[PDB]
Amino acid sequence: CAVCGWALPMQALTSCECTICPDCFRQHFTIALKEKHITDMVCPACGRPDLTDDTQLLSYFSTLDIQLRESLEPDAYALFHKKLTEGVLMRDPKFLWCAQCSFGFIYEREQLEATCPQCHQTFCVRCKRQWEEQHRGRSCEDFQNWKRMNDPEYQAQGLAMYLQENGIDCPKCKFSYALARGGCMHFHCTQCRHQFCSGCYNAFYAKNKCPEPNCRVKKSLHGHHPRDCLFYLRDWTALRLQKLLQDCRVIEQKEVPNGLRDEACGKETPGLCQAHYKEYLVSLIN
Amino acid sequence: MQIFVKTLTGKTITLEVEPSDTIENVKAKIQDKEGIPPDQQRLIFAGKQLEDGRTLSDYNIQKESTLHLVLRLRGG
Amino acid sequence: MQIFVKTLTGKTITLEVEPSDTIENVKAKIQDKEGIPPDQQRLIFAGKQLEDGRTLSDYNIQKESTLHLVLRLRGG
Amino acid sequence: LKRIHKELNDLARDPPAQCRAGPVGDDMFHWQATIMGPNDSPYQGGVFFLTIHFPTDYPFKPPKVAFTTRIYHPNINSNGSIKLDILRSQWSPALTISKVLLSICSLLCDPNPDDPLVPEIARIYKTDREKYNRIAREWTQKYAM
Ligand SMILES: [Zn+2]
Ligand SMILES: [Zn+2]
Ligand SMILES: [Zn+2]
Ligand SMILES: [Zn+2]
Ligand SMILES: [Zn+2]
Ligand SMILES: [Zn+2]
Ligand SMILES: [Zn+2]
Ligand SMILES: [Zn+2]
Structure with a gap:
């Protein structure tokens, strides 16, 4: 040796x-x-x-x-x-391993759809991913977007967050709507006919209808609000609102003679207008 | 081409569409089947708000895709 | 003389051959036993691609040698 | 159109008399109205002009009503839009423009600061009624003649 x-x-x-x-x-x-x-x-x-x-x-x-x-x-x-x-x-x-099993084969073709001799499952030769016909005549990154966008749970969260940003849920019957801006605080639930505030979610009562005791102006149209509500902080100017936290092209739905139509705010911006920029800071305090 | 539309209620509907259909057209089909006025309809796909002037193909909405329907509310 | 042919599946077959057999002949035997057309067959020995016109003895393929079968997959 | 004609006849037959309203020209779906500032309100002595647009499906959807005279009010914005329940979510086909005008007159006399359209005006009305009255009077003199 x-x-x-x-x-x-x-x-x-x-x-x-x-x-x-x-x-x-x-x-x-x-x-x-x-x-x-x-x-x-x-x-x-x-x-x-x-x-x-x-x-x-x-x-x-x-x-x-x-x-x-x-x-x-x-x-x-x-x-x-x-x-x-x-x-x-x-x-x-042009040798491939099959994208699902351990088999391989020399794939000599002018095609992307490729089914495997052994396990008989199809995949894209390029993205080596399971072939649905959505892919047919689409680039790989295209189809792979479709998958990702179309998969529920992505959709579930992409929605859920949409309603996080843009939702409004009737406090009584709990029905979820998508907030159309341009309107005021006092809402009417189209499902159950309730009336309520955008900020606090406490109710609104018409004339001679307020039940909660120690109400002073029962005669009027009104609703009860906390100190917190946009209602009260809307009366503060930008100036005061700012330091608490230290320590115009927004789309309103606008009525025309034959229906409602979406349009931007159009208001002078001191890049949001006076009112909208106030809504900005109010939201951050909660 | 067929697609699905589901509301927060959980109800799902099936629409017959073509990729060239505008979002406006799709809202009109939902009105036909469900009685909901287009002005009260917000449609979402994969978290994106679908805008009236665009088409299904603009949003890469394929066969068997699911749209989400949310009703619109304005204060009074 | 007997030799072995194994595929990526792991299946091994036994062929009866003589050293003078062409690679073409060996593919014809595999077709007989396995139903795979010769035009779809790639045979390898010790990493060398075996070419149709040559013989087993050209490649020093002895008794009890193992060849590897890999499919070539052909469109229209 | 028949309903609008019936309302016009009722209005003319039994003039409401703080207010007036009628078609501007030949379009029966577009009306102008006037409201006299309520007595003992800051708006007294003023005459305030409004525009009324009836929808094609009236009376099953409400008229669109807006002030065209500037006014200092918790429930009325610079564009003359009015926060009044019957104009929006509380409309019924049993309601009439005469009733709407009466309700707006009542609103002028008795604002609802709790459900404001103009937050700062609502705040002043609640916190300094005398200041509110003074400013509402100034606006009445300025834009209501
Ligand atoms: Zn050595
Ligand atoms: Zn040794
Ligand atoms: Zn396989
Ligand atoms: Zn691919
Ligand atoms: Zn409700
Ligand atoms: Zn109360
Ligand atoms: Zn509130
Ligand atoms: Zn704005």
Whole structure:
């Protein structure tokens, strides 16, 4: 042995033919498959052939094959085959691994829709993702948007947040609407006919209808509000509103003679108008 | 092409549309089937507000997509 | 002389061959046993692509050698 | 159109007499109205002009009513839009323009600062009624003659 120093009665391998004992012959190559890669399936003593390139020199592997067949336990002798043939498979062809199973095949076509011989599932050869016909004649990033936008839970949250920003939920029957701006504080729920405030959600009562006790102006149209409500903080100018927190093109639905039509605010901006910029700061305090 | 529209009530409807249909057209179909006036309708897809002058294809709305219907309210 | 052919599925077959057999002949035997058309077959040995006009002995393919079968997948 | 004619006949037959209203020209769906400032309000002595637009499906949807004379009021904005329940969510086809004018006159006499359209005017009305009256009087002199 070169590596461990015996001299007893196989290793006819290219550029060399050094002696190697069979206990440490196995171990060198068993390591070189289970740890190193194919380029490293070399003589330990000389370190020679150069397996970067030459294909007919890869006749070397034919000769190895027999030696490893019996010496290597089949676990690692498998890996010799696996590594070696998978090596050339991944050398620039139109070779694909199937996107779902462990199979592969040389896909020589002018097409993207590709069904797998083995598991019979289809995928895009480019994005290697399961093929629905939505993809058909669409770029990969296009289809992959569709998926993402169209998937519920994204939709669920994209909505849920939309209602976070733009919603308004009748306090009585709890029905969720989408707030049309331009209107005033006193709302009418189109489902159950209730009346209420935009800020506090406390109710509104018509003339001679307020039930809550210690009401002073029961005679009038009114509703009861907390200190917190936009109602009360709308009466503060920008000036005062600002320091509490330290410590125009908004779309209103506007009535015309034959219906309602959305239009921007149009108001002079001292980039929001006086009123809208006040609504801005009020919201942040809650 | 068929698409779905679902309201907060949980009710889902099926519309027959083409990708070239404007959002206005889709609201008109919802009015036909549900009686809701277009002026009271807000439609959303993947969190995006769908605007009247645009088409289904502008928003990449494909076959079997689901739109969300939310009713509009103005204060009084 | 007997040799083995294994596919990516892991299935292994046994062929009865002689060293003078062309690669074409071997593909014809695989077709016989497996139903795979020769035009869809790529055979590899020790990382070398086996070409149709050559023989098993050209590639130093001995008794008990294992070839690898990979499908070529063809449109219209 | 028949309903609008009936309302006009009722108005003319039994003149409301603080107020007037009628078609501007040949379009029966567009009317002008006048309201005299209520007595003992800051608006007394003023004459205030309004525009009324009836919808095609009247009486099943409310008229659009707006002041065209500037007025200092918690429930009326610079554009003359009015916060009044029957003009919006409390309309019924049993309601009439005569009743609407009466309600607006009542509103002038008795504002609802709790449901304001103009927050600062609502605040002044609540916090300094005398100041509110003075300013409403100034606006009446300024824009109501
Ligand atoms: Zn040794
Ligand atoms: Zn050596
Ligand atoms: Zn597969
Ligand atoms: Zn793709
Ligand atoms: Zn309700
Ligand atoms: Zn009260
Ligand atoms: Zn409130
Ligand atoms: Zn604004």
